Amino acid sequence: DARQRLKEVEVDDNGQFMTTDFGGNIEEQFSLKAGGRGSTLLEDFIFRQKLQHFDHERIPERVVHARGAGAHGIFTSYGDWSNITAASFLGAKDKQTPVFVRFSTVAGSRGSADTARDVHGFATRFYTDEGNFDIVGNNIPVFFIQDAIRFPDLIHSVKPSPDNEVPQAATAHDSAWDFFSSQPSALHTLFWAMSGNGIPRSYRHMDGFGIHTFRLVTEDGKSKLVKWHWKTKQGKAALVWEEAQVLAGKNADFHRQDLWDAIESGNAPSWELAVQLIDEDKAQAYGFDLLDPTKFLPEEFAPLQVLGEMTLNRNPMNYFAET
Amino acid sequence: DARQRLKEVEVDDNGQFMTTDFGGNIEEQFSLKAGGRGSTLLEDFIFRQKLQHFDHERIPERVVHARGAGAHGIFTSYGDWSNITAASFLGAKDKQTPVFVRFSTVAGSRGSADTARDVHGFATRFYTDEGNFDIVGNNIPVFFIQDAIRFPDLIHSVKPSPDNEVPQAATAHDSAWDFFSSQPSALHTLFWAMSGNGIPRSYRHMDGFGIHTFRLVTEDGKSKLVKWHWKTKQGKAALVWEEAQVLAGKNADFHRQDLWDAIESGNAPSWELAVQLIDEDKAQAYGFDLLDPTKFLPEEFAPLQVLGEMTLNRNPMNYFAETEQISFQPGHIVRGVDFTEDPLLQGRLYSYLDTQLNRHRGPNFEQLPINRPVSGVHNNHRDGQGQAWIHKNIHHYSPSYLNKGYPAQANQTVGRGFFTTPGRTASGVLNRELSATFDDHYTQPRLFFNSLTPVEQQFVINAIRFEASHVTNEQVKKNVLEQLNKISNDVAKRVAVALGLEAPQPDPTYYHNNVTRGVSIFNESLPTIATLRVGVLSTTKGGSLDKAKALKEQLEKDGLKVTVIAEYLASGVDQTYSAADATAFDAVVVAEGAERVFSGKGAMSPLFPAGRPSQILTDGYRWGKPVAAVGSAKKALQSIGVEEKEAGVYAGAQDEVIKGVEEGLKVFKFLERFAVDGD
Amino acid sequence: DARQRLKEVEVDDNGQFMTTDFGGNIEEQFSLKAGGRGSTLLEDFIFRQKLQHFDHERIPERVVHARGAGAHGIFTSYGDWSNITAASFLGAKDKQTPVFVRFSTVAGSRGSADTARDVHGFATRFYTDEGNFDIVGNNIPVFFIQDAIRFPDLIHSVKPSPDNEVPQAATAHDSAWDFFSSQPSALHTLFWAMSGNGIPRSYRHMDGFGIHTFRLVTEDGKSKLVKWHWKTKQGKAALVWEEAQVLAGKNADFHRQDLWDAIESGNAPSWELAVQLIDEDKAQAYGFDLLDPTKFLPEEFAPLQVLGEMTLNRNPMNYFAETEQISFQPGHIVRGVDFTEDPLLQGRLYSYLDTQLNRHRGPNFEQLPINRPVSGVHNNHRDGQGQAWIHKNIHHYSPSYLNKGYPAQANQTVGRGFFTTPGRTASGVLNRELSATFDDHYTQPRLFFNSLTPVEQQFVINAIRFEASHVTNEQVKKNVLEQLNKISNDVAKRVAVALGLEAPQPDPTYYHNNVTRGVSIFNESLPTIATLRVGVLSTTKGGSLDKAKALKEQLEKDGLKVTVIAEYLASGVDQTYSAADATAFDAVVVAEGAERVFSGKGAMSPLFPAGRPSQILTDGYRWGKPVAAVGSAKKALQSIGVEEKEAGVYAGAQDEVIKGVEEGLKVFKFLERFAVDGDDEE
């Protein structure tokens, strides 16, 4: 069970009496009143502890990728990769590591539709025996901008107009295409989002990418440049736009339902973790700069090496507490 | 200008150089790096001040009514109403008060669709010269539950299931119908939410309600019970469900865009404010207890008395700072108004103050520009997070010799202070109970259903059929049917058909045939057609476009917003078939010559999805809209099997079509096209 | 008026009726009850709105420097300094810029005593017309550590033990001296805090330092390394430890009251802004690395050059909204100034921005009235908790056709934008290390100790003796002694005596005899005695009060604040003996006739604790203050064993005493009254 360590915080209310948050059994279906048809008393601590908790349930949604869904699973390494990396979770054949993965769109708020056209998030945590390692990736291998200081400009232009907060979860408005045409680095990702990558059939039918070049480092300090790749074993599949639009209204939850159903039915999705490995002296040798996140490395120049496999096989118990 | 007081906080960036938030001009398009392809430096204060503010832009959404939109305006009183209330904003004829109104759904999160089926919020702030007065109401006059302690139970059951957070902005799932049938008080508001009130055409086509009975109080402490009503000057209007579903996908912003456009185009919407006034000794005189928020007062017993009118004529300048940040409270009460012992209202007073602590993370949210009163704040409150003022009075306590008695106390007799209705009494034991006067949950649901037109009744039954068919648990569906049967055996039989369950035996305890006025939507044509939208389907080939323009210029003379649609954005074309959908329009008319895109090669084009012009006309017809074609374009009507003999179908020359469509827009929906059980 | 810009947010409640926070007149002295002796109603919206605001009054104190006080004022440049800096506030002779300054201790929480022994903060905001410029400084020129990543270690060890939260506002405990001996770079700031700088007489009697080397940058991009200095016009003055301890109990607000009183009485304090300027090519040329914040630059190598003067002349109107809420940042930098690669400075830039999110619970704290610039804020920032503005530009991003390029980019040549020093370069491997140029932790502590007067040195040894003797762990104490011995063998031996430990052998690697100017306090008399306080001990019986009133009047003509003390608040009495203490005054004068209360019947009275007049005179003498007696009051001096011709003791007629006491206030502390090691030997 990938969720094994979380059983100690699970709370079972079956067969119990209602309590306050500081203990003691209660009833909480009637306010305390001063007479039959009377006012509610300030001394009804039961009312106020129950309503205070409700009044304070919400926390800010993520600034981007607010709409998403996730699940637990296991990563298994196919080998002892110590010749390219000292990373413990890649250190032995068949070594297993718990994961959690969250998938998402980018622009829309918490309740926007799964089948909006957008870049999609693909964030993986490895709960390794040497710390948590996240690959915070997208379903498209390149990003809109070349410098992090421009992120608020990109996001502001794609998110709704600040005077009336229209349109929800959509790049089809003036400010977005103003930014895309004024900041031409954005054209590459734009083309990806305009393709089937912008309206996938489901989370299980997407690849994932780290985008950035990272480094793998061995015990003695030898380094290689690396691109992370998630290759779906379900195959890539996309919708067409006129169908995605109706689906946004007939079932805003289409993707999170699809993931939930696949896992519950025992059809856990899988992805292979793979890498392109580049020598340090070739960082600029392939017709672009590998520090430039608006470019991907064509596989003909550096084929994928398969490190292992991840399977997502347990749904969360409480969406808020986990996802 | 209703927004006049906000001018002093507006920031103009035209012609300015970029700065940090602490002054000094900067550039902020490149991170500071150690060498040409180097790492970013911690000492880049520009980068970090910019991203820190971005990183922290979001605040928690409202716990309920997260999806909404609002606007500024002016309320005008029609009279000096001092004989019924001491409230200052009602104190003189033609007296004007700025307002802000926010409309909303209830269940869905921010970003969920406007045209989800739901209760709708209708919340008004009056910035009166004696404080902010909020009427925090809904578009439905009754609520699901009788005691505020039950609100989390209602909301949890209706909001997404907590394991997978499915479904968004919908009551069509097990937990909601488990609550509705386990808590039968909820049946009245449910029936309303299943009627046209759950899928309104726009915010501007809703009535509003305070729901609760309040008190109006004169200077001497004499009180009247009161129900607040907003009556839309635009008329009530509703979609049909199969349309609202597509619209939720084609335009999640349909209602906020509609409000915005109406105000921008100078077609400001209006509501009259009206009251039902009841003597204190009649609180239990009308077949129910006026302390009970699951019942409304039939207008036959107390007619609506018009007090004034509100017009929303200013859009906000920044949505977040104004609409997202505004903090409504039913406890925002002023002299001349008082509460009642309504157990739902009673607990609301605690919850709305408390919840701002979460949403604004501090106690000083009333100092935000959109929350400030215009009347002046003078008290001994100090400090707290984000304290925006600097107080002069060192002696921040009372009583005190050193501050000479200021700020001073105000009550009924001195200083126009607030005061509780002098005659209210408490009597009896302290109890955790509800009055037995609250026990009838079935009569008024039956009263509401009785008072709708036959197809309007069919819409309610079809909403229930749709929703309850999503409930996976068989026993919950039987429980729903048992409860519905107590309202009307015929409703239960008709719902049970969809669910595959047996028609239950009549349970006549609460059955009755009474009707009441003012709850129907579809029994009344609209008073105006201004701002309603006409989709004119055309084509770039031949001379159809010049005719569409002529057609457009005439329709606009009546105040319609007209969109000419064609294959691409040729001169005179407002929208492409690719971008177009029937859900955007109140009427669809095919311009002459455009029949060439309804069959053959004209219908097969890379520029729009296959069949799109036919789908728009088919949708418009099946959703009950006025539809039309000029001249030869009648062939487009034939291509989808629609005949000119039908109500709300118009063909012929241009002038005959304009007149027909314009009369059809007042009917708005042609209910002839919707099948009724056994007809 | 330096507070002028804040007048638009000031709320006047006089002549008004009480309201709620959303308007509407109310009464709020009775809860709404269900019956005459009934329970309080939940529908009492007035009760809850009032108590909710009260319940939420507090915000987190500052993580360090929680205890302090501030005031508004004006800075005036003495010239056009464009030849060394493009900084606008230094751009023209007699150019005036509003300021706010907050002084503080470091370790104690919000309610701790002003006269705890500690380093002291000295933070100045310049509200320049090109943004807010902050110099976030201390009253000591060197800091404990060399790398900012070590700041939580330093602060954890000095703050109270995490099991019982003991001791408050003090380094006299095991963990602090464990850190000082385990992290020897700390020893230099330690010596300064063990000197008079640890217990200053007032905020007005402190010098201030930016500590770090910064850069001044001209328009064409040429740079010079700079150290910032505040030179107090009131002179440096310090207490003695045994007096500061009693003062912490008798008046924990001594420093903030002192400052408030100086400003209310029209005696606004001033400091001159001075710099040291160093060529870039000489950063490592003075026996240490100028990127090392544990070193200062001797004035003999680079003299102070005065640029302007700052005067604090307006008290806050609401302490919380101004002093508590103000958010200083060394990242508050403007065109014409730049950072250096000082690894302590580097991490501060991150820390002060981040910590504001904790203290203010949101990102809009620069919108608070006390934090607002006077020069204008124009950017694409939006939203956030407590957003106080309504932005008009709906195209909140760059680059953009739709907003016509506005707000526009500003850089070195366009729009007077900030720019990093053009010549700065990075070279070599990414590393988690410190330059070996930082390695000497003992030479400058030895230089500092060498530069104090003999009794001033004894104060340092006695502070260490006091503090180290609170250390329960024997080995920590030996560790401290070994480290002290690397600075000075005689210091280590004198400290070891108090600890009962063996005199260590000389370890002379860092020993030297060099001295420097400008670090002593007691080797220079005060340039003025304005605002200094004289307690006049008198009595209600006989003619003493009339004489005391005449003494006060003459002393006030010289700018002194005079308190006449007696048994009860008779006419002309400012304070009772029960309420009085020597710690409140800089000189103690017994009025003629008041000898009555120093022995016999007059000394035992129900109106004050037994012996209190004698104790006030005894404390005043033993703590080094000028003390005096007019006429027959000389018996009060005799009754505590004080001779009339001692240094700093004045007896005689009224006029000779006034003259003697005014002279002695310039000396301030009479250091002949403190024994030095070796004095008691037989």
Ligand code: HEM
């Ligand atoms: C290669 C480019 C990028 C990728 C692949 C990416 C991916 C993601 C993903 C998948 C998430 C959602 C993780 C989740 O499900 O919780 C996320 C959230 C976020 N991203 Fe990025 N992003 C990129 C660029 C940026 C940049 C340049 C910034 C800012 C400098 C940024 C700031 C954020 C923030 C602040 C969040 C919110 C995270 C939270 O609240 O937990 N992203 N991003």
Ligand code: HEM
């Ligand atoms: C007659 C019954 C009710 C009506 C007409 C009503 C109406 C509304 C409306 C219109 C809003 C949105 C205000 C806005 O647009 O910002 C709202 C929000 C809210 N309601 Fe109610 N509601 C009712 C019952 C309740 C009850 C029983 C509770 C709890 C005891 C409650 C708690 C809340 C809270 C906490 C919010 C969020 C307020 C904020 O964050 O600003 N409501 N309600």
Ligand code: HEM
């Ligand atoms: C030369 C070294 C330093 C000096 C002169 C200095 C000075 C000061 C002063 C004067 C204050 C109080 C400002 C006020 O009165 O509000 C302060 C606060 C503070 N310091 Fe430093 N400090 C130094 C080192 C550091 C370091 C290395 C760090 C962390 C890396 C740090 C973190 C802080 C924080 C977080 C605050 C609280 C600020 C706030 O809450 O507004 N300091 N410092």
